[PDB]
Design an enzyme around this catalytic site. Structure first.
Site, PDB file in Angstrom:
ATOM      1  N   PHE A  81       3.588   9.621   0.391  1.00 35.59           N
ATOM      2  CA  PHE A  81       3.399  11.033   0.086  1.00 35.59           C
ATOM      3  C   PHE A  81       2.389  11.686   1.024  1.00 35.59           C
ATOM      4  O   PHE A  81       2.086  12.877   0.909  1.00 35.59           O
ATOM      5  CB  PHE A  81       2.988  11.207  -1.380  1.00 35.59           C
ATOM      6  CG  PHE A  81       4.099  10.913  -2.370  1.00 35.59           C
ATOM      7  CD1 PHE A  81       3.850  10.936  -3.738  1.00 35.59           C
ATOM      8  CD2 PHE A  81       5.384  10.626  -1.936  1.00 35.59           C
ATOM      9  CE1 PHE A  81       4.859  10.678  -4.652  1.00 35.59           C
ATOM     10  CE2 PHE A  81       6.403  10.366  -2.851  1.00 35.59           C
ATOM     11  CZ  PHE A  81       6.137  10.390  -4.203  1.00 35.59           C
ATOM     12  N   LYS A  82       1.877  10.895   1.958  1.00 36.16           N
ATOM     13  CA  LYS A  82       0.927  11.392   2.955  1.00 36.16           C
ATOM     14  C   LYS A  82      -0.094  12.350   2.353  1.00 36.16           C
ATOM     15  O   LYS A  82      -0.289  13.480   2.819  1.00 36.16           O
ATOM     16  CB  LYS A  82       1.669  11.960   4.172  1.00 36.16           C
ATOM     17  CG  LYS A  82       2.331  10.811   4.969  1.00 36.16           C
ATOM     18  CD  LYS A  82       2.888  11.204   6.306  1.00 36.16           C
ATOM     19  CE  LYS A  82       3.561  10.010   6.972  1.00 36.16           C
ATOM     20  NZ  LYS A  82       4.687   9.485   6.136  1.00 36.16           N
ATOM     21  N   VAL A  83      -0.757  11.865   1.306  1.00 32.98           N
ATOM     22  CA  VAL A  83      -1.601  12.707   0.483  1.00 32.98           C
ATOM     23  C   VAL A  83      -2.695  13.340   1.345  1.00 32.98           C
ATOM     24  O   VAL A  83      -3.431  12.647   2.056  1.00 32.98           O
ATOM     25  CB  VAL A  83      -2.188  11.915  -0.696  1.00 32.98           C
ATOM     26  CG1 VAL A  83      -3.007  12.830  -1.587  1.00 32.98           C
ATOM     27  CG2 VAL A  83      -1.051  11.255  -1.510  1.00 32.98           C
ATOM     28  N   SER A  90       2.945   7.986  14.772  1.00 28.41           N
ATOM     29  CA  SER A  90       3.768   7.448  15.849  1.00 28.41           C
ATOM     30  C   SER A  90       4.515   8.492  16.692  1.00 28.41           C
ATOM     31  O   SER A  90       5.051   8.159  17.748  1.00 28.41           O
ATOM     32  CB  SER A  90       4.780   6.450  15.269  1.00 28.41           C
ATOM     33  OG  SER A  90       5.754   7.125  14.480  1.00 28.41           O
ATOM     34  N   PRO A 102       5.232   1.885  11.212  1.00 31.76           N
ATOM     35  CA  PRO A 102       6.534   2.538  11.396  1.00 31.76           C
ATOM     36  C   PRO A 102       6.729   2.953  12.845  1.00 31.76           C
ATOM     37  O   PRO A 102       5.819   2.770  13.654  1.00 31.76           O
ATOM     38  CB  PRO A 102       6.401   3.784  10.532  1.00 31.76           C
ATOM     39  CG  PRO A 102       4.948   4.181  10.729  1.00 31.76           C
ATOM     40  CD  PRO A 102       4.174   2.865  10.906  1.00 31.76           C
ATOM     41  N   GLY A 122       8.449   1.207  18.968  1.00 25.98           N
ATOM     42  CA  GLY A 122       7.964  -0.086  19.421  1.00 25.98           C
ATOM     43  C   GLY A 122       8.929  -1.229  19.156  1.00 25.98           C
ATOM     44  O   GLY A 122       9.961  -1.049  18.501  1.00 25.98           O
ATOM     45  N   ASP A 123       8.591  -2.407  19.675  1.00 34.02           N
ATOM     46  CA  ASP A 123       9.428  -3.594  19.516  1.00 34.02           C
ATOM     47  C   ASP A 123       9.042  -4.383  18.266  1.00 34.02           C
ATOM     48  O   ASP A 123       7.864  -4.667  18.039  1.00 34.02           O
ATOM     49  CB  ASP A 123       9.331  -4.488  20.752  1.00 34.02           C
ATOM     50  CG  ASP A 123      10.038  -5.820  20.567  1.00 34.02           C
ATOM     51  OD1 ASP A 123       9.366  -6.810  20.194  1.00 34.02           O
ATOM     52  OD2 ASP A 123      11.266  -5.876  20.793  1.00 34.02           O
ATOM     53  N   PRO A 124      10.040  -4.752  17.455  1.00 33.11           N
ATOM     54  CA  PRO A 124       9.750  -5.426  16.186  1.00 33.11           C
ATOM     55  C   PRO A 124       8.788  -6.598  16.366  1.00 33.11           C
ATOM     56  O   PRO A 124       7.729  -6.616  15.742  1.00 33.11           O
ATOM     57  CB  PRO A 124      11.125  -5.911  15.730  1.00 33.11           C
ATOM     58  CG  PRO A 124      12.079  -4.941  16.349  1.00 33.11           C
ATOM     59  CD  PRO A 124      11.486  -4.613  17.692  1.00 33.11           C
ATOM     60  N   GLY A 125       9.140  -7.552  17.221  1.00 32.22           N
ATOM     61  CA  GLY A 125       8.293  -8.706  17.469  1.00 32.22           C
ATOM     62  C   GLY A 125       6.882  -8.389  17.927  1.00 32.22           C
ATOM     63  O   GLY A 125       5.914  -8.891  17.354  1.00 32.22           O
TER      64      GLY A 125
HETATM   65  O1  LIG Z   1       3.395   7.640  11.958  1.00 34.26           O
HETATM   66  C1  LIG Z   1       4.325   7.575  11.161  1.00 34.26           C
HETATM   67  C2  LIG Z   1       4.074   7.543   9.774  1.00 34.26           C
HETATM   68  C3  LIG Z   1       5.141   7.456   8.920  1.00 34.26           C
HETATM   69  O2  LIG Z   1       4.968   7.406   7.587  1.00 34.26           O
HETATM   70  N1  LIG Z   1       6.419   7.420   9.395  1.00 34.26           N
HETATM   71  C4  LIG Z   1       7.487   7.327   8.388  1.00 34.26           C
HETATM   72  O3  LIG Z   1       8.164   6.105   8.585  1.00 34.26           O
HETATM   73  C5  LIG Z   1       9.587   6.287   8.408  1.00 34.26           C
HETATM   74  C6  LIG Z   1      10.288   5.940   9.697  1.00 34.26           C
HETATM   75  O4  LIG Z   1      11.695   6.069   9.565  1.00 34.26           O
HETATM   76  P1  LIG Z   1      12.664   5.896  10.816  1.00 34.26           P
HETATM   77  O5  LIG Z   1      12.668   4.320  11.156  1.00 34.26           O
HETATM   78  O6  LIG Z   1      14.144   6.313  10.397  1.00 34.26           O
HETATM   79  O7  LIG Z   1      12.051   6.514  12.021  1.00 34.26           O
HETATM   80  C7  LIG Z   1       9.786   7.721   7.936  1.00 34.26           C
HETATM   81  O8  LIG Z   1       9.786   7.760   6.504  1.00 34.26           O
HETATM   82  C8  LIG Z   1       8.548   8.435   8.470  1.00 34.26           C
HETATM   83  O9  LIG Z   1       8.175   9.583   7.722  1.00 34.26           O
HETATM   84  C9  LIG Z   1       6.636   7.443  10.729  1.00 34.26           C
HETATM   85  O10 LIG Z   1       7.771   7.402  11.171  1.00 34.26           O
HETATM   86  N2  LIG Z   1       5.598   7.522  11.601  1.00 34.26           N
END
Ligand SMILES: O=c1cc(O)n([C@@H]2O[C@H](COP(=O)(O)O)[C@@H](O)[C@H]2O)c(=O)[nH]1
Ligand SMILES: O=c1cc(O)n([C@@H]2O[C@H](COP(=O)(O)O)[C@@H](O)[C@H]2O)c(=O)[nH]1
Lengths: 215, 213
Positions: free
Chosen positions: A63-65, A119, A172, A179-182
């Site tokens: 909810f990014k409060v 990100s 995220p 970015g790369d998963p690994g």
């Molecule tokens: O810096 C951030 C912070 C996030 O919460 N998110 C959240 O992470 C999720 C990424 O989803 P997606 O892999 O489809 O890009 C989204 O819900 C987005 O709001 C993000 O992408 N970057």
């Protein structure tokens, strides 16, 4: 938190029927689901309890409060009453705002994740410059759970250095435009993936593929 | 935006019955209501259309939108689909995040308010230092509506200088900031608990309105 396969689903579909189907399909790979406002504002806060019961998963309310302390408390309490295991809060509004969320989480036996840096490209404008200081504020407040961007691993490494090895970090922005998963998992405890899974023709296969790539 | 009596009610009660009662009690003074997550998360997004229908008021959805562009886009669509006349968005996450809300609002014929600086103490740690740049960013994006703090009159004056006279500026934290002085710079003030927790909300509102003229 024990996140299965170190992979968190970002369930940002805005239709109940579709969100249920996709989440159900990937439960074998993912037991921790991040639910945000797109789904909640479309389908109601009841969707959180429904997900927990239907899929036996942990829920992170994204909810990014980002309000003043009193409003923050109201949001956190409502969110935990609705069954959320954790809630994600912004650090840029200051220590008192973050402290308020920590109050409520402590009181109710739940968790706060602090979002220290983002990100997307716009994060360069104000957030990046404040990120180290926000993370240190988190440490000073006793925050143990963090969110930071996979889009740049050098920044992610610096964040992990600030928060220490004991803190939990989720990340995220994974994929082509990210970015790369690994590599990300060198620093983060778990990655967050959304559209790559929930818009896939075969979500289960998409998830399996990501988990494969990080065996 | 035409705000009756330059006074916006911050309806942060979390019970529908009480929220409706109090809002009814001040409708003769206030035609513009700020509804945030406390009420919406408790009672559901349908409460927005219910307020607009029952009170013939305008609703500003105070959701302090603060995500990445694609997520902000979704939040704004859902919010405007629910009938909100306007949405409040954070500037700290940067231009693309704000642009997403602006684009949706413009496509749907609604409004965006850019929150530039907050009124609480913790706002001094990070936001205050970025506030003027955030306002300038908004100006270049074509933002015409802004939110800034009554608790810091000097900051409010500078924000008005940056956004110019044609932009619309609303301001919370009054109690606290003084109504009259705040309105030297803001077009309207936002007032919550001192109205909605009062014995007589109507008189509370009437008193505030009186102290302005
Ligand atoms: O810096 C951030 C912070 C996030 O919460 N998110 C959240 O992470 C999720 C990424 O989803 P997606 O892999 O489809 O890009 C989204 O819900 C987005 O709001 C993000 O992408 N970057
Ligand atoms: O900087 C800000 C921005 C806000 O939206 N607000 C909001 O304005 C309202 C103020 O209510 P109150 O007058 O009872 O303090 C609350 O809804 C709060 O979330 C604020 O107080 N300060």
């Amino acid at each position: 938190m024990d996140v299965m396969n170190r992979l968190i689903l970002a369930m940002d579909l805005m239709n109940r029927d579709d969100a249920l189907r996709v989440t159900g399909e990937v439960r074998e790979y993912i037991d921790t689901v991040k639910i945000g406002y797109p789904l909640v504002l479309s389908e109601g806060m009841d969707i959180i309890a429904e997900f927990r019961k239907r899929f036996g998963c942990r829920i992170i309310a994204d909810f990014k409060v980002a309000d003043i302390p009193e409003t923050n408390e109201k949001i956190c309490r409502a969110t935990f009453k609705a069954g959320a295991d954790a809630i994600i809060v912004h650090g840029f509004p200051g220590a008192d705002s973050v402290r308020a969320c920590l109050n409520v989480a402590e009181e109710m036996g739940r968790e706060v994740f602090l979002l220290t840096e983002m990100s997307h490209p716009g994060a360069e404008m104000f957030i990046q410059g404040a990120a180290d200081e926000i993370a240190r504020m988190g440490v000073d407040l006793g925050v143990k759970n963090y969110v930071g961007p996979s889009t740049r691993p050098e920044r992610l490494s610096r964040l992990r250095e600030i928060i220490g090895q004991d803190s939990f970090l989720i990340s995220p922005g994974v994929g082509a435009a990210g970015g790369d998963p690994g590599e990300t998992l060198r620093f983060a405890d778990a990655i967050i993936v959304g559209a790559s899974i929930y818009l896939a023709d075969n979500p289960a296969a998409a998830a399996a593929g990501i988990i494969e790539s990080i065996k």
